[PDB]
Amino acid sequence: MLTDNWKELAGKAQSTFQKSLKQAIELADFDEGLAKRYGALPSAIGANVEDFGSPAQFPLEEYLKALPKKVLDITEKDPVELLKDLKSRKVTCVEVLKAYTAASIVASKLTNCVQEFLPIEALQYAQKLDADYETKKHLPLYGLPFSIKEMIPFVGRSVTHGSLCYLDRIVDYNADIVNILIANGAYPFVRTTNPQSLMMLECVSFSHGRTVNAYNGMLTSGGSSGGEGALNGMRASPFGLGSDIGGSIRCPAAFNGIYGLRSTLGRIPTADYFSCNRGSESILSVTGPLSRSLDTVNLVMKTVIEAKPWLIDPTLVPLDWKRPENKKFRVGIYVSDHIVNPSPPINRALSMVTEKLKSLGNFEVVTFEPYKPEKVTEILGKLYFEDGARDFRATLQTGEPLLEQTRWAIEGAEDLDMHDQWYWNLQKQAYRKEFLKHWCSYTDNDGNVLDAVIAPVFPNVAAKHETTKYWTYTSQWNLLDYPVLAFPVTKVDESLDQPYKNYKPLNDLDKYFYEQYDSPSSFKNAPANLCLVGLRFTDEKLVEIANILRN
Amino acid sequence: MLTDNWKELAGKAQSTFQKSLKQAIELADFDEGLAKRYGALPSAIGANVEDFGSPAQFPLEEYLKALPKKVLDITEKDPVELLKDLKSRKVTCVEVLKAYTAASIVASKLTNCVQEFLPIEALQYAQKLDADYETKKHLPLYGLPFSIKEMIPFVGRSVTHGSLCYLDRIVDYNADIVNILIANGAYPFVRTTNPQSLMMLECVSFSHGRTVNAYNGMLTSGGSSGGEGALNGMRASPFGLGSDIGGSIRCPAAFNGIYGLRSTLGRIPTADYFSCNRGSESILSVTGPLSRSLDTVNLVMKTVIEAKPWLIDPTLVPLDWKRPENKKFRVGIYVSDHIVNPSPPINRALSMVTEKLKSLGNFEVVTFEPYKPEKVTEILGKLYFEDGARDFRATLQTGEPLLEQTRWAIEGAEDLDMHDQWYWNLQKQAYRKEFLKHWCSYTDNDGNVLDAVIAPVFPNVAAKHETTKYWTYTSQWNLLDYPVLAFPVTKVDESLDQPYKNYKPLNDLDKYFYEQYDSPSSFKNAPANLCLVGLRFTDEKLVEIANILRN
């Protein structure tokens, strides 16, 4: 840990970003027309980490306008299809790198989703991938760059999870999942932004400033993997890796209208990531990919697991990544937990998806009721910061200010005695066992279990800044460790999504979210996503059902 | 002329081009990446002059993808801005030549717009211009290359206007306008294609094959300055010189979405060009610039006229090139001649330009009715080929086939007796006098004359091959000798430009053009241009109004 003044350290972080941005622009080699249009874009990057700039109203429109067809023809192509072009040599690995690097630079300025570009090592990866074309063409991800959340170790970099005090914490190794993906023909080219404490569903830190939504620049990108959500929502990366302990993969994915998988704990390696509360095991985070392309999420999962990562990380289970053979499906619709009702755009998305599943013959669709959702907050309120947030709070010895959203996550945290931890571990495992019984109560007379549940990711589309005051719609599945896949449905419609009249709130917090949704014009063009929830290790069922919903 | 078999001569024409193409590639000095992409481009050049190849759907998109930043940063620059860099020595005369030579090579393969490159003399011009930088820094076109239609004499070259029989017609001199432009720091670097007889609004000859549109390769470039329209539409030349006796400058410019000025006869020297019917004076062609850049059009006229060309060509009038001091404008909109109605894309261009002028306070906008447009065809029907096309048909003694478009131009040609010419000269002068009275009938109560008329250039955007069967929208102003400036407005919009419903044709020829517009997709991405018409010697009013329309 460092104890230097935070203002000096924020300088050092900005400098690291700016030096890599300069190198990124050199690699992309803009012609003067693009350099001009790029220069004139509204920036979400300020002069310092407390100045949040002036974001575009519709960053994706600005991105698609600014970039030349010569770049978009690569970055807008579905990554699995792009893998065919790299395999057949219609495009070089270095060519793909240049396009996506340029895309990420435009994305960085509009959304502020990049913490550090990796142009030096990425060119080395792509060049020798071209040189070794004949020997590595067979690899499942040959030539594809990808993004990694800053919390993921990469050789020679500091790993801070957004905390300035860790700027001298340099690693000489990559995370296991990074090396596995590299062994399969991929390589990271950019590090995405992460917020203070990582326990925020937004993306504000004193290492980068504020990250904004790819579809509406007045809204949050989400968090904790906010840079990944913004970068991949802008299609400026084929896919990315985030982490998810309270919604930190699915919230960015849903807010930015893309796919994001909270994978079951123990399938893919994440423990070598850096966060707060290192060594805490009561509730464990997971990783998983974010991408515009469901086929790319599936291929990344398939690639890492078929590399048998349990022979490097022993917390993992040797369970194959397998397409489910079920042709019939039983699916529940989780319309509300009856604590905070979803806003109109989320409710319309639930109806759309309900109607589509009912129209297909092989889906039986039932209502799914909550089971003690208040119990989610009680337990996670004790286990998220089980040291009373001492480990996080010590990071602020630099004077780094405490953000409003971080305040919520550490409010009330108890420094548990061993017997207190034991008490709540028993509360955790009992709730898990009770909920399984609840889930199995929906099995039919013939003995067919529920395959998946469809639920919101958040009580609304991308939230206004400093308003993500309810976690249960995502953290429920972290307490249970159920795999959850966020997927796109629709966008806000100003005609269809007017506020409910004569709404009677369920409680003060539901009242807060009701008044938060003042009108759809406040959320123009915001994607309305949902998620598919499955029992532990049924990840593949979720991919298969999402496949049907997009056809 | 020559009397050899035409197939041998077409070979000789192809050899001259291929010999100059080889020298151009050496001058351009491709690196391997460009040489590779150039080799793989779809060509509008065939194996022989009757084989038209397989052109790209969007030649311009292919051009922008194929050429490097090292080239596009110069050729995409507005030539007036590029002149600043040449003056301040931020860029070399040879550097600019190399970029534009490379651009024209790529443009040549994609659109077939180059008849002969001039890289030997161009390198000599550019090299000594660099050497003489300190003494020639002041010249208004210092360092700028430009293209010339093949009909324009250049030292040591054959001048054929596309007729194979004239391949032994070598000149030892440049055209007056060329020498003037050289005296002002410019130099020609490429010769562009022209069609058989020059009397078609397309660009097909047995010297080069078929020239295609820069924006949609299934459509014609226009003619007769078809190479000029394509080359400058691809922005592969800073500007070019064409000729216009029936629309042969404005039709290429309009089809390729750039500017083209049919300047008033008697301003800039053109008589030393070569065409058919040399010595025919009943209807005289004019020259004028084509360019992507309006500012470049204005500067060439200013440069040539300020060189006092009436001291070399005595047919010219000593009238300064002067920007008008008008603060108010009266402008007419020519919606139709009520013989052939414009297609939807042109019709929307008229409304767009109308609504823009009405939105500025200082424009009075009135509807402009036609005046006996049928008399245009009748008079031009007698005076275009007043020898009964005897001179042109003698070019076919080589066996050179008669193209379908040429057939239209010479069908019905009478070999006029002197009294017949006198009769039609009087008809010509009477119509001009009647039309002036028509124009002046639009003068308002305070005595303000119409400053300009906005009219179509053609009943449609760039035509499908062998369908340019109506000339009046351009030849009207050749009969009258009014200055006309073609200028860009919009592109085909597939939503907005669906065919007219419940359309009732005005006559057989109008029905033909209606059926020609089968759907906007047949003309995807084709520019919709219009033109500004002024009274004789008001060229500058047209430039000034075009300036306002593009801001």
PDB file of C-alpha atoms in Angstrom, chain A residues 347-525:
ATOM      1  CA  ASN A 347     -41.975  -4.743 -17.731  1.00  0.00           C
ATOM      2  CA  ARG A 348     -42.533  -4.457 -21.443  1.00  0.00           C
ATOM      3  CA  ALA A 349     -39.412  -6.549 -22.038  1.00  0.00           C
ATOM      4  CA  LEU A 350     -40.780  -9.266 -19.742  1.00  0.00           C
ATOM      5  CA  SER A 351     -44.066  -9.307 -21.679  1.00  0.00           C
ATOM      6  CA  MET A 352     -42.284  -9.436 -25.045  1.00  0.00           C
ATOM      7  CA  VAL A 353     -40.173 -12.388 -23.942  1.00  0.00           C
ATOM      8  CA  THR A 354     -43.148 -14.090 -22.292  1.00  0.00           C
ATOM      9  CA  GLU A 355     -45.164 -13.811 -25.508  1.00  0.00           C
ATOM     10  CA  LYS A 356     -42.324 -15.121 -27.675  1.00  0.00           C
ATOM     11  CA  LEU A 357     -41.727 -18.200 -25.502  1.00  0.00           C
ATOM     12  CA  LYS A 358     -45.449 -18.980 -25.321  1.00  0.00           C
ATOM     13  CA  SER A 359     -45.672 -18.810 -29.128  1.00  0.00           C
ATOM     14  CA  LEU A 360     -43.099 -21.616 -29.506  1.00  0.00           C
ATOM     15  CA  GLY A 361     -44.515 -25.087 -28.963  1.00  0.00           C
ATOM     16  CA  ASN A 362     -41.677 -26.603 -26.925  1.00  0.00           C
ATOM     17  CA  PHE A 363     -41.751 -24.032 -24.078  1.00  0.00           C
ATOM     18  CA  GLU A 364     -44.023 -24.209 -21.033  1.00  0.00           C
ATOM     19  CA  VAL A 365     -44.136 -20.819 -19.306  1.00  0.00           C
ATOM     20  CA  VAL A 366     -45.068 -20.321 -15.633  1.00  0.00           C
ATOM     21  CA  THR A 367     -44.972 -17.468 -13.143  1.00  0.00           C
ATOM     22  CA  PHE A 368     -41.992 -17.577 -10.762  1.00  0.00           C
ATOM     23  CA  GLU A 369     -42.594 -16.124  -7.257  1.00  0.00           C
ATOM     24  CA  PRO A 370     -39.837 -14.802  -4.967  1.00  0.00           C
ATOM     25  CA  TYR A 371     -38.480 -16.603  -1.920  1.00  0.00           C
ATOM     26  CA  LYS A 372     -37.436 -14.359   0.998  1.00  0.00           C
ATOM     27  CA  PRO A 373     -35.698 -11.686  -1.136  1.00  0.00           C
ATOM     28  CA  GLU A 374     -35.274  -9.609   2.040  1.00  0.00           C
ATOM     29  CA  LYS A 375     -32.942 -12.404   3.228  1.00  0.00           C
ATOM     30  CA  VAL A 376     -30.540 -11.563   0.407  1.00  0.00           C
ATOM     31  CA  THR A 377     -29.699  -8.130   1.847  1.00  0.00           C
ATOM     32  CA  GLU A 378     -29.468  -9.353   5.448  1.00  0.00           C
ATOM     33  CA  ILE A 379     -26.874 -12.040   4.664  1.00  0.00           C
ATOM     34  CA  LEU A 380     -24.858 -10.110   2.072  1.00  0.00           C
ATOM     35  CA  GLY A 381     -24.974  -7.122   4.433  1.00  0.00           C
ATOM     36  CA  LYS A 382     -22.933  -9.217   6.869  1.00  0.00           C
ATOM     37  CA  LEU A 383     -20.710 -11.187   4.467  1.00  0.00           C
ATOM     38  CA  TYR A 384     -19.725  -8.687   1.745  1.00  0.00           C
ATOM     39  CA  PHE A 385     -17.457  -6.710   4.138  1.00  0.00           C
ATOM     40  CA  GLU A 386     -16.985  -9.191   6.944  1.00  0.00           C
ATOM     41  CA  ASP A 387     -14.027  -7.272   8.411  1.00  0.00           C
ATOM     42  CA  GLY A 388     -16.166  -4.179   8.926  1.00  0.00           C
ATOM     43  CA  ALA A 389     -14.686  -2.727   5.701  1.00  0.00           C
ATOM     44  CA  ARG A 390     -11.338  -2.189   7.452  1.00  0.00           C
ATOM     45  CA  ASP A 391      -9.451  -3.495   4.427  1.00  0.00           C
ATOM     46  CA  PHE A 392     -11.207  -1.125   2.037  1.00  0.00           C
ATOM     47  CA  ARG A 393     -11.169   1.865   4.374  1.00  0.00           C
ATOM     48  CA  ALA A 394      -7.401   1.551   4.784  1.00  0.00           C
ATOM     49  CA  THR A 395      -7.037   2.283   1.058  1.00  0.00           C
ATOM     50  CA  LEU A 396      -8.153   5.860   1.763  1.00  0.00           C
ATOM     51  CA  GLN A 397      -5.052   6.715   3.844  1.00  0.00           C
ATOM     52  CA  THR A 398      -3.978   8.584   0.724  1.00  0.00           C
ATOM     53  CA  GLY A 399      -6.889  10.940   1.363  1.00  0.00           C
ATOM     54  CA  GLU A 400      -8.738   9.528  -1.646  1.00  0.00           C
ATOM     55  CA  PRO A 401     -12.331  10.742  -1.134  1.00  0.00           C
ATOM     56  CA  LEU A 402     -15.088   8.275  -0.285  1.00  0.00           C
ATOM     57  CA  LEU A 403     -17.598   8.129  -3.138  1.00  0.00           C
ATOM     58  CA  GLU A 404     -21.321   8.263  -2.441  1.00  0.00           C
ATOM     59  CA  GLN A 405     -21.978   4.857  -4.025  1.00  0.00           C
ATOM     60  CA  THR A 406     -19.097   3.257  -2.106  1.00  0.00           C
ATOM     61  CA  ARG A 407     -20.635   4.707   1.072  1.00  0.00           C
ATOM     62  CA  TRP A 408     -23.768   2.599   0.584  1.00  0.00           C
ATOM     63  CA  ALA A 409     -21.797  -0.617   0.211  1.00  0.00           C
ATOM     64  CA  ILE A 410     -19.774  -0.180   3.430  1.00  0.00           C
ATOM     65  CA  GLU A 411     -22.501   1.377   5.595  1.00  0.00           C
ATOM     66  CA  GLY A 412     -23.238  -0.797   8.591  1.00  0.00           C
ATOM     67  CA  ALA A 413     -20.480  -3.328   7.904  1.00  0.00           C
ATOM     68  CA  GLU A 414     -19.664  -5.384  11.002  1.00  0.00           C
ATOM     69  CA  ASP A 415     -16.196  -6.658  11.892  1.00  0.00           C
ATOM     70  CA  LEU A 416     -17.377 -10.213  12.493  1.00  0.00           C
ATOM     71  CA  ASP A 417     -16.102 -12.398  15.308  1.00  0.00           C
ATOM     72  CA  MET A 418     -15.487 -16.001  14.196  1.00  0.00           C
ATOM     73  CA  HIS A 419     -18.774 -17.086  15.775  1.00  0.00           C
ATOM     74  CA  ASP A 420     -20.563 -14.313  13.893  1.00  0.00           C
ATOM     75  CA  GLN A 421     -19.096 -15.564  10.604  1.00  0.00           C
ATOM     76  CA  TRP A 422     -20.154 -19.129  11.433  1.00  0.00           C
ATOM     77  CA  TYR A 423     -23.674 -17.938  12.238  1.00  0.00           C
ATOM     78  CA  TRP A 424     -24.004 -16.231   8.850  1.00  0.00           C
ATOM     79  CA  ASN A 425     -22.344 -19.024   6.870  1.00  0.00           C
ATOM     80  CA  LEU A 426     -25.114 -21.219   8.277  1.00  0.00           C
ATOM     81  CA  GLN A 427     -27.618 -18.532   7.274  1.00  0.00           C
ATOM     82  CA  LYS A 428     -26.064 -18.573   3.796  1.00  0.00           C
ATOM     83  CA  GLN A 429     -26.123 -22.349   3.287  1.00  0.00           C
ATOM     84  CA  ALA A 430     -29.634 -22.709   4.732  1.00  0.00           C
ATOM     85  CA  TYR A 431     -30.993 -20.019   2.402  1.00  0.00           C
ATOM     86  CA  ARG A 432     -29.296 -21.812  -0.497  1.00  0.00           C
ATOM     87  CA  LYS A 433     -30.912 -25.094   0.533  1.00  0.00           C
ATOM     88  CA  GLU A 434     -34.324 -23.500   1.070  1.00  0.00           C
ATOM     89  CA  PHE A 435     -34.194 -21.769  -2.315  1.00  0.00           C
ATOM     90  CA  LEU A 436     -33.326 -25.016  -4.092  1.00  0.00           C
ATOM     91  CA  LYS A 437     -36.454 -26.507  -2.503  1.00  0.00           C
ATOM     92  CA  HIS A 438     -38.410 -23.483  -3.761  1.00  0.00           C
ATOM     93  CA  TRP A 439     -37.029 -23.950  -7.278  1.00  0.00           C
ATOM     94  CA  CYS A 440     -37.796 -27.681  -7.259  1.00  0.00           C
ATOM     95  CA  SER A 441     -41.357 -26.974  -6.084  1.00  0.00           C
ATOM     96  CA  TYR A 442     -41.995 -25.827  -9.673  1.00  0.00           C
ATOM     97  CA  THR A 443     -41.232 -29.272 -11.101  1.00  0.00           C
ATOM     98  CA  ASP A 444     -44.351 -30.582 -12.832  1.00  0.00           C
ATOM     99  CA  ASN A 445     -46.389 -33.746 -12.348  1.00  0.00           C
ATOM    100  CA  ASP A 446     -44.199 -35.529 -14.905  1.00  0.00           C
ATOM    101  CA  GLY A 447     -41.032 -34.621 -12.996  1.00  0.00           C
ATOM    102  CA  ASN A 448     -39.674 -31.999 -15.428  1.00  0.00           C
ATOM    103  CA  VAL A 449     -37.642 -29.435 -13.491  1.00  0.00           C
ATOM    104  CA  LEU A 450     -37.552 -25.720 -14.226  1.00  0.00           C
ATOM    105  CA  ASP A 451     -34.797 -25.144 -16.782  1.00  0.00           C
ATOM    106  CA  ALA A 452     -34.466 -21.387 -16.346  1.00  0.00           C
ATOM    107  CA  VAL A 453     -36.100 -18.282 -14.917  1.00  0.00           C
ATOM    108  CA  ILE A 454     -36.387 -14.963 -16.742  1.00  0.00           C
ATOM    109  CA  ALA A 455     -35.898 -11.930 -14.509  1.00  0.00           C
ATOM    110  CA  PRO A 456     -34.754  -8.299 -14.573  1.00  0.00           C
ATOM    111  CA  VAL A 457     -31.124  -7.400 -14.095  1.00  0.00           C
ATOM    112  CA  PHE A 458     -32.088  -4.098 -12.392  1.00  0.00           C
ATOM    113  CA  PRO A 459     -35.369  -2.308 -11.517  1.00  0.00           C
ATOM    114  CA  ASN A 460     -34.841  -0.018 -14.542  1.00  0.00           C
ATOM    115  CA  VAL A 461     -32.736   0.537 -17.648  1.00  0.00           C
ATOM    116  CA  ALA A 462     -29.331   2.209 -17.209  1.00  0.00           C
ATOM    117  CA  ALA A 463     -29.656   4.263 -14.034  1.00  0.00           C
ATOM    118  CA  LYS A 464     -29.017   7.931 -13.484  1.00  0.00           C
ATOM    119  CA  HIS A 465     -25.699   8.535 -11.751  1.00  0.00           C
ATOM    120  CA  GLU A 466     -25.603   7.805  -8.002  1.00  0.00           C
ATOM    121  CA  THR A 467     -29.005   6.060  -7.968  1.00  0.00           C
ATOM    122  CA  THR A 468     -28.147   2.320  -8.008  1.00  0.00           C
ATOM    123  CA  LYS A 469     -29.561   1.864  -4.518  1.00  0.00           C
ATOM    124  CA  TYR A 470     -30.991  -1.645  -4.957  1.00  0.00           C
ATOM    125  CA  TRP A 471     -28.948  -4.759  -5.734  1.00  0.00           C
ATOM    126  CA  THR A 472     -31.238  -7.726  -5.090  1.00  0.00           C
ATOM    127  CA  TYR A 473     -32.259  -8.294  -8.724  1.00  0.00           C
ATOM    128  CA  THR A 474     -28.675  -9.282  -9.364  1.00  0.00           C
ATOM    129  CA  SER A 475     -27.060 -10.035  -5.967  1.00  0.00           C
ATOM    130  CA  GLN A 476     -29.714 -12.679  -5.211  1.00  0.00           C
ATOM    131  CA  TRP A 477     -27.886 -14.898  -7.685  1.00  0.00           C
ATOM    132  CA  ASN A 478     -24.475 -14.193  -6.142  1.00  0.00           C
ATOM    133  CA  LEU A 479     -25.707 -15.410  -2.745  1.00  0.00           C
ATOM    134  CA  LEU A 480     -27.041 -18.524  -4.493  1.00  0.00           C
ATOM    135  CA  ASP A 481     -24.148 -18.798  -6.980  1.00  0.00           C
ATOM    136  CA  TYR A 482     -26.569 -19.435  -9.829  1.00  0.00           C
ATOM    137  CA  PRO A 483     -25.358 -18.896 -13.404  1.00  0.00           C
ATOM    138  CA  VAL A 484     -27.112 -15.920 -14.982  1.00  0.00           C
ATOM    139  CA  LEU A 485     -26.987 -14.708 -18.596  1.00  0.00           C
ATOM    140  CA  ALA A 486     -27.987 -11.138 -19.410  1.00  0.00           C
ATOM    141  CA  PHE A 487     -29.402 -10.727 -22.918  1.00  0.00           C
ATOM    142  CA  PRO A 488     -30.946  -7.942 -25.038  1.00  0.00           C
ATOM    143  CA  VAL A 489     -34.673  -7.565 -25.619  1.00  0.00           C
ATOM    144  CA  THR A 490     -35.727  -4.061 -26.659  1.00  0.00           C
ATOM    145  CA  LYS A 491     -35.035  -0.351 -26.290  1.00  0.00           C
ATOM    146  CA  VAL A 492     -37.064   2.276 -24.448  1.00  0.00           C
ATOM    147  CA  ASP A 493     -40.060   3.532 -26.430  1.00  0.00           C
ATOM    148  CA  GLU A 494     -41.323   6.962 -25.438  1.00  0.00           C
ATOM    149  CA  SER A 495     -44.861   6.079 -26.556  1.00  0.00           C
ATOM    150  CA  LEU A 496     -45.017   2.661 -24.857  1.00  0.00           C
ATOM    151  CA  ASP A 497     -42.974   3.489 -21.727  1.00  0.00           C
ATOM    152  CA  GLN A 498     -44.787   6.376 -20.035  1.00  0.00           C
ATOM    153  CA  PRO A 499     -44.791   6.286 -16.206  1.00  0.00           C
ATOM    154  CA  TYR A 500     -47.560   4.353 -14.502  1.00  0.00           C
ATOM    155  CA  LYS A 501     -50.354   6.577 -13.230  1.00  0.00           C
ATOM    156  CA  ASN A 502     -52.021   5.881  -9.865  1.00  0.00           C
ATOM    157  CA  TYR A 503     -49.029   3.775  -8.891  1.00  0.00           C
ATOM    158  CA  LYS A 504     -48.935   3.004  -5.187  1.00  0.00           C
ATOM    159  CA  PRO A 505     -45.377   2.266  -4.054  1.00  0.00           C
ATOM    160  CA  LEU A 506     -44.642  -0.822  -2.020  1.00  0.00           C
ATOM    161  CA  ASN A 507     -42.228   0.961   0.354  1.00  0.00           C
ATOM    162  CA  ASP A 508     -39.891   3.932   0.635  1.00  0.00           C
ATOM    163  CA  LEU A 509     -37.284   2.308  -1.618  1.00  0.00           C
ATOM    164  CA  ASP A 510     -39.870   1.412  -4.259  1.00  0.00           C
ATOM    165  CA  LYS A 511     -41.036   5.021  -3.981  1.00  0.00           C
ATOM    166  CA  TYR A 512     -37.454   6.146  -4.688  1.00  0.00           C
ATOM    167  CA  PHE A 513     -37.293   4.071  -7.882  1.00  0.00           C
ATOM    168  CA  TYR A 514     -40.768   5.190  -8.988  1.00  0.00           C
ATOM    169  CA  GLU A 515     -39.874   8.870  -8.715  1.00  0.00           C
ATOM    170  CA  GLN A 516     -36.514   8.071 -10.314  1.00  0.00           C
ATOM    171  CA  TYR A 517     -38.380   7.125 -13.528  1.00  0.00           C
ATOM    172  CA  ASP A 518     -39.670  10.606 -14.299  1.00  0.00           C
ATOM    173  CA  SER A 519     -40.175  10.031 -18.045  1.00  0.00           C
ATOM    174  CA  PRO A 520     -38.765   7.840 -20.846  1.00  0.00           C
ATOM    175  CA  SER A 521     -37.150  10.941 -22.377  1.00  0.00           C
ATOM    176  CA  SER A 522     -34.732  10.820 -19.415  1.00  0.00           C
ATOM    177  CA  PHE A 523     -33.603   7.385 -20.727  1.00  0.00           C
ATOM    178  CA  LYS A 524     -33.578   7.898 -24.523  1.00  0.00           C
ATOM    179  CA  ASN A 525     -32.255   4.895 -26.497  1.00  0.00           C
TER     180      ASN A 525
END
